[PDB]
Amino acid sequence: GSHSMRYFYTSVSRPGRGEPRFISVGYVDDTQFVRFDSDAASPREEPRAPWIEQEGPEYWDRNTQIYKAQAQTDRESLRNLRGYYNQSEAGSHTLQSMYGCDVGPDGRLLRGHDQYAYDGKDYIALNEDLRSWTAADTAAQITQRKWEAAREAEQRRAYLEGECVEWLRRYLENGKDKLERADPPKTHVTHHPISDHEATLRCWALGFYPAEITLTWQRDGEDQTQDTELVETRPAGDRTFQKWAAVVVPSGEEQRYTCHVQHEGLPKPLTLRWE
Amino acid sequence: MIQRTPKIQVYSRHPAENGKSNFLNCYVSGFHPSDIEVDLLKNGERIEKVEHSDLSFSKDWSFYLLYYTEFTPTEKDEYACRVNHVTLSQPKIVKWDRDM
Amino acid sequence: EPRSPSHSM
Ligand SMILES: OC[C@H]1O[C@@](CO)(O[C@H]2O[C@H](CO)[C@@H](O)[C@H](O)[C@H]2O)[C@@H](O)[C@@H]1O
């Protein structure tokens, strides 16, 4: 199917306590596969999914040096940014970076991404054309002019069209079923009396991958959208996800309610009931 | 500076059954800035060996983390998650309920 | 694999 690779960097300054903390994580779809933390004992890129472990020592060594250099660059960017915004040199600030590629079933690039946020606000982003920047304000225009003069967009385009696509293809081949084949949810309905007149029906979806899912309660086939409590999809901690949806119903009317589950891993949408 | 208040959910990795080994999770998400303190509590006391996922974030730049520990649920033992963040005027405690 | 370092902002 269609797949993505993304890297997420976070740098947080701490003036008076040393250099900023830099953390990076890499994802293929909804699966984290690598991490780096500048505050680790002997910082290096580390595996976080079984299928990446097979990469040789040259892979880990090259990526580790990249993150160490990027941390130093982010430190200089944080210094420049507080200057652009005329901010105190005493305070802590955050620079986040996100980049990567979306590819189709054939493995061809559909869309590239390279964008940045300062103190939680969009700052600068590479446009869809992979050739031009969009700046959020006059500070970001300073960065834009620097990056235009340095031909930074060409450096990003080269990665996003080349290495990003090629390495994503390789991770998918190595990952196999864990990445290419969706794991459908294990599902069940629970019932919890609230009083003699009302009970909660809760529809559970557990152990599914990827995270995208829809859970809806219907009463005689009419969606109960305005009366359903839905929790945000949440990680189980073993690389799968969980969600539930609940409705409060009159005692003795439970048979009127069905839960409808849509997930990529299911052959067809499921209809569940209290049983 | 943008501040966003954390959302918190506390739950087990698998449906709880007393005497059977499991994982207790506290998922904190939707927050900014990244500085946050999360403790898992067993009968009101801080659990000592707690791990957390690597700091990551969503499309709106808000952060998320999973704090987790191996545990064996019983009938008696009460579990909870306590979270401190700049946006919270006091620590937020969310109790574990095996049906949620 | 990650992208090689950017220029600073
Ligand atoms: O929080 C427990 C801790 O507090 C101490 C005082 O340092 O004792 C208090 O809590 C005890 C357990 O509930 C009580 O028995 C006692 O009355 C109370 O002062 C410590 O002894 C204990 O480890």
Author numbering:
A (entry chain A): 1 to 275
B (entry chain B): 0 to 99
C (entry chain E): 1 to 9
Question: What does the publication say?
Answer:
To exclude the influence of different crystallization conditions on protein conformation, we generated fully isomorphous (having the same space group and very similar unit cell parameters) complexes between HLA-B*0702 and the following peptides: MLL747–755, pMLL747–755, DOT1L998–1006, pDOT1L998–1006, E7P-MLL747–755 and OSE-MLL747–755. The highest affinity was observed for pMHC in complex with phosphopeptides pMLL747–755 or pDOT1L998–1006, with KD values of 1.9 μM and 7.7 μM, respectively. The serine-phosphoserine replacement only slightly decreased both pMLL747–755 and pDOT1L998–1006 KD values, despite the salt bridge between the phosphate group of pSer-P4 and the guanidine group of Arg62. In line with such a notion is the fact that pSer-P4 in the pMLL747–755/HLA-B*0702 structure adopted two alternate conformations—one with phosphate H-bonded to Arg62, and a second one (with occupancy refined to 0.3) with phosphate H-bonded to the Gln155 side chain. A strong salt bridge between phosphate and more basic Arg62 would have prevented the second conformation. However, in the structures with phosphoepitopes, the guanidine group of Arg62 was H- bonded to the phosphate moiety. Formation of this bond required a 0.5 Å shift of the Arg62 side chain towards phosphate, which occurs in concert with Ile66 switching to another alternate conformation (as indicated by the arrows in Fig. 2e) to prevent interatomic clashes between Arg62 and Ile66. For instance, in the pMLL747–755/HLA-B*0702 complex, the Oγ atom of pSer-P4 is located within hydrogen-bond distance (<3.5 Å) from the Arg62 guanidine group. In the pMLL747–755/HLA-B*0702 structure, the guanidine group of Arg-P3 is H-bonded to the Asp114 and Tyr116 (both in strand E) side chain atoms, whereas the Arg156 (α2 helix) basic side chain is H-bonded to the Glu152 and Gln155 (both in α2 helix) side chains. Buried water molecules help to stabilize the Arg-P3 and Ser-P6 side chains at the binding site.
